Design a protein around this ligand. Sequence first.
Ligand SMILES: Nc1ncnc2c1ncn2[C@@H]1O[C@H](COP(=O)(O)OP(=O)(O)O)[C@@H](O)[C@H]1O
Ligand SMILES: Nc1ncnc2c1ncn2[C@@H]1O[C@H](COP(=O)(O)OP(=O)(O)O)[C@@H](O)[C@H]1O
Lengths: 109, 109, 50, 100, 250, 451, 47, 148, 248, 50
Amino acid sequence: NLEQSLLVAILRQHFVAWEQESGTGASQAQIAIDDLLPQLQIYLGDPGSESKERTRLLTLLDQLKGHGLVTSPDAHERIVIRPIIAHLADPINLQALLAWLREQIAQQT
Amino acid sequence: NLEQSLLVAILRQHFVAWEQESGTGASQAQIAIDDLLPQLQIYLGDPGSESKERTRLLTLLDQLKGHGLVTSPDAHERIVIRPIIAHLADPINLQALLAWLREQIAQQT
Amino acid sequence: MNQVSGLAGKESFILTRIELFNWGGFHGLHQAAIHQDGTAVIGPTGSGKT
Amino acid sequence: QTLEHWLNVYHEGGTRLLRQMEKEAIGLWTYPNKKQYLARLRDFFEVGENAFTLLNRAAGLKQLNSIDEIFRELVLDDHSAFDRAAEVANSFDGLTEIHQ
Amino acid sequence: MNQVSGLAGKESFILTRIELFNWGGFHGLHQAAIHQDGTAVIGPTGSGKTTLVDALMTLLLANPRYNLASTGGHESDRDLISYVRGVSGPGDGGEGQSHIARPGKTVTGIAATLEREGKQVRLGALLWFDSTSSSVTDMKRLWLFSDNPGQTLEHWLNVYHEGGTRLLRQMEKEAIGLWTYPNKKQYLARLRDFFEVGENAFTLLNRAAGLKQLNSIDEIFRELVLDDHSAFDRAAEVANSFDGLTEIHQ
Amino acid sequence: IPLEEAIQSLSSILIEHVSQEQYDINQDNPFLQASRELREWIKRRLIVERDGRIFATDALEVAITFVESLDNRFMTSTASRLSTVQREIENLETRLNPNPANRVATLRRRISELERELQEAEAGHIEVLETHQAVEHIRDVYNLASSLRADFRRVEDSWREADRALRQSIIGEQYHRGDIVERLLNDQDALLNTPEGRVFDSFQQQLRQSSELKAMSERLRVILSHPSASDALNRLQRHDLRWLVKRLVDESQTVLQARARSERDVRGFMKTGLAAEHHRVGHLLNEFLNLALKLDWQRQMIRKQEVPLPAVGVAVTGIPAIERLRFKEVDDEAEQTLDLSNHAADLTQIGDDFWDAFNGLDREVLIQQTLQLLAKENRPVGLAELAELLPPAHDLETFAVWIGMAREAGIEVIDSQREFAELSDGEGRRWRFNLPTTGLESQALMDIDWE
Amino acid sequence: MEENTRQRTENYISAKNQHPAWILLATRRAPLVLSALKTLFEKSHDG
Amino acid sequence: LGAKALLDPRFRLEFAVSVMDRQSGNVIESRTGSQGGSGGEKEIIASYVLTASLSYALSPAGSRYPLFGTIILDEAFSRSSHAVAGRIIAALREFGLHAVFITPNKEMRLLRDHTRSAIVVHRRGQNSNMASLSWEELERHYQRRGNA
Amino acid sequence: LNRSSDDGVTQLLSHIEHEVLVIEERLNELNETMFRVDFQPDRYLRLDTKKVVHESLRTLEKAQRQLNAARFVDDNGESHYKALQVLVAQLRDASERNRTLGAKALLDPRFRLEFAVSVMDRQSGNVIESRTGSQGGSGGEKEIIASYVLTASLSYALSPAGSRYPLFGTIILDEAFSRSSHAVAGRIIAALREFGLHAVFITPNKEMRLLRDHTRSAIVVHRRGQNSNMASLSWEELERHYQRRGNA
Amino acid sequence: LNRSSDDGVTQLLSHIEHEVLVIEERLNELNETMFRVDFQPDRYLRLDTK
Ligand SMILES: Nc1ncnc2c1ncn2[C@@H]1O[C@H](COP(=O)(O)OP(=O)(O)O)[C@@H](O)[C@H]1O
Ligand SMILES: Nc1ncnc2c1ncn2[C@@H]1O[C@H](COP(=O)(O)OP(=O)(O)O)[C@@H](O)[C@H]1O
């Protein structure tokens, strides 16, 4: 669902940024949870309670881990992006989704 | 959980009794809510209301149907015991728990 | 020495009883009152004081 | 309500029974998680957590070293600003990265 | 309860007498004796009871944990000059030195006497300030050892008053069974040779004096019994040389 | 308030107003009601909670300031206010005057004024504020300075909004690196240009010369000590003003936090010297995100739409094998009844050593008995004579006590000459003692206290 | 001090139910009336 | 040390203690640099400071007397003579506290005086017990032990 | 590289192992001396030790083995320098982190081995308990073990070369029994007697009951303001009899 | 950059200084409380900081 897809997009951006650093390299695409919350706040808004948004983000991350795209959190509030993301956010899939979503917005009028 | 174990045990004994009545596989076993509720309350007691009684009964029935043991009650509140029940894993454990249950029914009254 | 104790127990809460059970070395049930004027606790070295 | 009563009810029924008598009785509450209880304690006695934290570390103070140790450890609430310095340095490094 | 102490006398020396002078708050001469079978010490807290023990321990280690028992594990709270000065802490913010008993040019001494099977040893030491400066470098001292009871701390103080420490050096050679070391290491070596025991034993003794807090069974050995002699400085120098090695390789 | 603390405090406060029955309220769980109300106010943006704590939003600050400006309000039409305005208008005019001669004349008259004040003060005729007028003169500075917090309450919000705008704009695919740096600089400068921006900048300039802010804080500390302060302000208002400088310093931190937060996503975005495929997917994602903003995220049903993304990394599990079933165990049915019996101790076990300690020599009674006895003896008395005239039941500690009294009183003790005494313990075994020569005297001994 | 806190709620109820300004702010037409009044007196020298 | 001295507030300040005469502006004593050395003096000083701070922290704002006055004190009397133990008890009482002292069966002479009850406890192998006795009910027990 | 080989990490690790073996020798000889007295009516104390199982030391042994392999395979010393760099990097990591226990395991000889104590039967030598009777110090109980072991070690260290008895018997204790009951300080002094160490006790007029028994003289110290003085007091049991045809 | 990071750093230093002042005020408050009780027969304790 498109919330999971938004988190997927952000994760894919972070993943490609990581892959630049050392090519494909290892599977250690590490990120801090505090980095994601600022991103989501822009789209999902600000419910005005930092803890509430943290819980929301953790719920989404749990769903994604259910889809196998992210490791569960750890003691340092870090997660590592599963490489499987590269084949779900495949530019072909991204463009198909983008066309569908452009259609959606056009209809929204 | 013990509630589900009791329910499956009672359904298993009912199914085998029905197969004695009509032979093997001649007809799918059945039971109504009318007969059900008393037999469950025999060992479980009053959860707090009749509404809660039926709620719990239907919840366990739905979970069993998820496990494939039973169908959901029809318009007349009668379920069909799925023939699959004949091939459970450890019927000896069921018989042992049934022995414990039939001991406790007499002990506590 | 002790005569200032009059004000000790007026405006504050004071610990006056501890009921214990199956805690630490104290098996079963136990109790121990505490006098509001000051109470010591005494026992052999390593006898369940701490 | 006394400890004896609590244990008696705990065993007589299940843990569920405890939270049932919580409702039935008067002047009795429970908090299955500790912090929800310690907040009630601090409120009822109108003292911040630092007071009890001092009480406990005071009950057994036997090091009893120089005064500076007493204060710096037991007395004063902990508000060191290491993480803030870390944040300041990190942001400065980020801006230097922009400049580079 | 203490009958074995006589056999220990047949197998060891035991301290029987302590003489002080201008040490701590104990102005002027002071003395004490110790029964063969062991003694206690008593006095209201803050009266010099640990002061005496420190006075003894100054003659047995290069630099012991002065006043160790007060803190326990943590740093020593005092130094030789403070005792020689009769210090009693900063009596006021203005620091008028009234709390200091001997701020001026004075003398000081400590003496111990031990016995094994009647035969008697006698330690000693003289500390003297010829100026109001209170730096450790100005702590002119002279340790003394002797196996003859004839030598007495009273006699040493009287000789010092009669003339400079050179008189002490002369009577060292004139007096049978006497020694004086202007530095501590010679004295400590002589003591350890006499007792056929290494200095780590006396360090352990100082540990024992203020034996205090510890957490578990391992800490006993680790922090009381053994001498760590950790080689971290070896690590530092190894890394330093390896730095040049790595530079050459680069 | 830490949130767990706020819930309970507000539950208690609600319990108080259950007597205000004209307002409908829940009367079965005043704790749950508290949390529900707290959540509601979170929704209204009345209170914003961060890092687990809670803080009052500017809206609630202003609302409070409203009701407090009703009957219990403070007043500003004051001679103190007029003095302030007069002085500060003089200052403003003199500053705005560009003619140097006019400034010279103004300073020549001000210097003479202050010199006259100095002459009066040196004459011993110093004058204080009428102690009663002090209450109003302090209320004046309090009310005057109370505005600054209400102003930072909005400086923070303005910079937060600027940062949020920078975020939602940086997503733009049309934006390139040069656009982003330019927008950062322009946004920050424009924010600094607005009035609140100049407020923040002036406050910052004060910090460079901290001497003045610290001097102000010290003066305020002195002021609130003067007795009249207690009449003018309660403890709360004094608590604020005493640390107004600190509360401003701390409050500005959020501004710097927003600034650094925006710089974070500038930095994380300028590093885009990518390879080919990464450059392609970057454009794809940026365009998709720019599309994303247009939707209505707040809507639930918009949110739970199903995208057409293909199923990859698909997994299959939970094959419903009937044989996989297992069943409950109850065999540990043995009931361990209660050990409610009272196991209170019986003193028979108590070892004799504990009793021996329980009979510790009472020092003070020994002091009193010695003073009494030496009163009637009225002469020097050695310790042996004391034992003879007084049986030391608990033995050694007595000798120490007597010699301690001697020493405390400055009584001479000649350790080199000795006396002796004989005694016996509680079980009859005899003992002998060696003691120093000394003499106790009642008059000198009782001349000093004891404990 | 915080003993008055119990009474402060009654004080605020009084203010809400009687004080003119507060009652004005609660009216369905509060902004229009307040704006009109503001404009009216915005030009005053005195009464 | 440097890191604390920079980014930890409290480490910028010394915490010397001093004694003030009630009826004079002099400073009778100060204790910093050298920490006094005395095993008792340190004990009394620390106990008094800690008790005062604890009382202040335990008191609701504006109240002289603490709302929660029970302070559990272990045998910090270990370094305490009787002469200073009495002072500790007096001070603790004057701050409005109520002290439940613990001690290993030693230094009970002054406890008999400056306290009114006690809890005796038993060490019985892998077990323990407790009993609440007033000093006099214990005195009679000691007398009975003396008799038979 | 070769000039740093002898002075390098391997020699340091050998030195540390030599120190550990010295510690083992000391522990063994001490444990022998504990056979000469009793910790309990029918028990004597025994000391044990094992090598610490911290994985950091295991990584170190892996590195040292690999260095041994590379020290005699010739590539102009590339692999030798690689292994030496790895080892010295770990060593520097430990040195910087000296305070934490991980580094102490490497650089601190004491931490190289963990210790334990066993209640041994004096008669059969069988084990009754293999560690302290308390997990953490149960108040005065940690005084028992600590003082017992320290007195033991001090006696052993004070014994001349090969002497079964200490040539220096006068231990000095200050605030001796600060956290010990009578039933504990009594056993402490009894142990001191067993090891044959003359004792001197300091106390703030505490536990006078026990000192009255287990000593014969006391030195009184008192402070008149900014001054103090002293006196020597003593006692002894008279020889004629305890009492006339009575209790002893 | 010279503006923003300078602002952050100076602000943090001033925050540290204000924490120090708060500690000093706390010391004064405690000193007041300890004026209430006699440390010695005719003396009371007071804390001074540097
Ligand atoms: N984790 C533990 N560590 C040490 N002792 C423990 C522990 N748990 C229980 N104990 C038991 O509890 C007792 C604690 O001793 P205690 O009397 O409270 O100390 P103190 O000597 O100061 O009085 C011990 O006798 C011991 O049997
Ligand atoms: N060298 C010193 N440095 C600091 N204070 C000292 C020193 N010497 C004496 N004092 C003071 O003089 C007394 C010394 O007595 P001391 O034996 O050290 O105390 P305690 O009886 O607890 O062992 C104490 O009151 C101490 O405060």
